[PDB]
């Protein structure tokens with residue numbers, strides 16, 4: 001039921017993670033557009049599919065992809081800002097909309113990749129039920145820059161469950177925000193304390209990629225990673241397995257076995273984001289080391305504000321009721337020039353709590369996902385600044 005389009009391809013093809021891509025032709029409603037091969041194969045590419053073929057728009061173009069109107073959909077846009085003969089990739093500035101929602105605006109894939117030190121870029125969105133049978137994806141080149149063109153290498157539309165419900169509003173009394181109908185952009189998706197998980201090993205058929213979190217640690221210490229044995233079973237109970245694959249829950253980052261120092265420090269991650277949006281932080285948890293409630297009890301801070309702490313700190317077993325049972329909690333934080341970081345940073349910090357006299361002083365995180373919530377029918381932010 002997935003639609004994985006390699007834009008500008010001639011024939012179907014399979015990538016290095018055994019995903020099958022089909023030509024975008026049948027879904028492109030705009031005639032006479034140009035396709036172009038990239039003339040350089042960056043060593044960082046894990047496959048030529050779909051990155052080595054592109055479609056290049058010098059006028060607006062529209063894709064029409066059939067979707068079931070009441071189901072949520074993941075949308076992925078794949079960009080390889082390489083060399084295409086006769087074009088300067090630095091002249092590419094454009095917008096992308098999904099129905100009436102602006103995804104990208106004045107978007108420079110080249111500048112964005114230069115800032116991340118990446119050769120290609122994948123933008124991933126989760127679109128709420130649309131009530132339409134067609135998802136219209138519109139590429140519009142900037143009319144502000146002449147020579148401006150738009151380009152695309154791959155488009156995926158992937159049906160997905162309603163994995164979003166409510167988020168706890170950070171810095172507020174029991175205040176809860178509804179996210180069931182939100183349109184999201186994925187900012188980060190981390191398998192905390194474990195290996196990269198390729199899309200082929202994701203749960204729910206969702207082919208999400210989960211990255212090791214170490215590149216985002218900003219505390220002086222990296223903590224201690226924990227990994228359950230190969231055969232150890234995660235008992236989802238009634239939690240949808242599409243939430244996250246077992247290997248997210250079978251691995252974790254903790255502060256470690258030395259409790260006195262753990263009280264001396266936070267485990268700290270930091271992330272660059274766009275200002276003037278609310279973000280959902282989904283923290284994934286599973287205790288597979290300790291056995292009872294009130295043994296691992298810790299505070300969680302988000303942008304220096306208490307997310308779980310004071311008289312209600314995080315206790316994974318307190319939440320789940322058993323080893324090997326997974327759970328997660330959603331927290332919502334609004335990021336403006338108030339926060340950062342110059343308004344462009346999310347920090348996540350964990351440290352032991354002494355509340356209730358826990359047996360140990362430690363903290364733990366198994367997974368992390370960060371989503372931008374759409375406001376004013378817009379998810380687009382500025383291009384990053386390379387230095």
Ligand SMILES: *[C@@H]1O[C@H](CO)[C@@H](O[C@@H]2O[C@H](CO)[C@@H](O[C@@H]3O[C@H](CO)[C@@H](O)[C@H](O)[C@@H]3O)[C@H](O)[C@H]2NC(C)=O)[C@H](O)[C@H]1NC(C)=O
Nearest residue numbers: 090093105106107108111112142144145382383384385386
């Ligand atoms: C479309 O997006 C591009 C983003 O690449 C915008 O151009 C960029 O604008 C920024 C800020 O206006 C420029 O950076 C600034 O330079 C000065 C002087 O060094 C510095 O003091 C500032 O702190 C900042 O670094 C940046 O050079 C410029 N990039 C390019 C390639 O021109 C553009 O304005 C956007 N257009 C619209 C209509 O939104």
Ligand SMILES: *[C@@H]1O[C@H](CO)[C@@H](O[C@@H]2O[C@H](CO)[C@@H](O[C@@H]3O[C@H](CO)[C@@H](O)[C@H](O)[C@@H]3O)[C@H](O)[C@H]2NC(C)=O)[C@H](O)[C@H]1NC(C)=O
Nearest residue numbers: 273274275276277335336337338342343344380381382383
């Ligand atoms: C994040 O949100 C703030 C708050 O809305 C944005 O700042 C606002 O930006 C607008 C337009 O840039 C400002 O209004 C304009 O004022 C100029 C004179 O400076 C004039 O040409 C117009 O009358 C126009 O209304 C507004 O004053 C300003 N407000 C505040 C509180 O800063 C900010 O741009 C947003 N940041 C991003 C990255 O989107």
Ligand SMILES: *[C@@H]1O[C@H](CO)[C@@H](O[C@@H]2O[C@H](CO)[C@@H](O)[C@H](O)[C@H]2NC(C)=O)[C@H](O)[C@H]1NC(C)=O
Nearest residue numbers: 263264265266301302303304305306349350351
């Ligand atoms: C762990 O993380 C938080 C970071 O927000 C720290 O608690 C903040 O500490 C600073 C100064 O250290 C204060 O200005 C803030 O008001 C504190 N926030 C809250 C909600 O109390 C904490 O100091 C860090 N370190 C340790 C050892 O806990």
Ligand SMILES: *[C@@H]1O[C@H](CO)[C@@H](O)[C@H](O)[C@H]1NC(C)=O
Nearest residue numbers: 303304338339340341345347
């Ligand atoms: C949190 O505290 C640090 C202290 O160094 C500060 O720089 C930052 O702006 C604060 N706010 C955040 C991270 O939102």
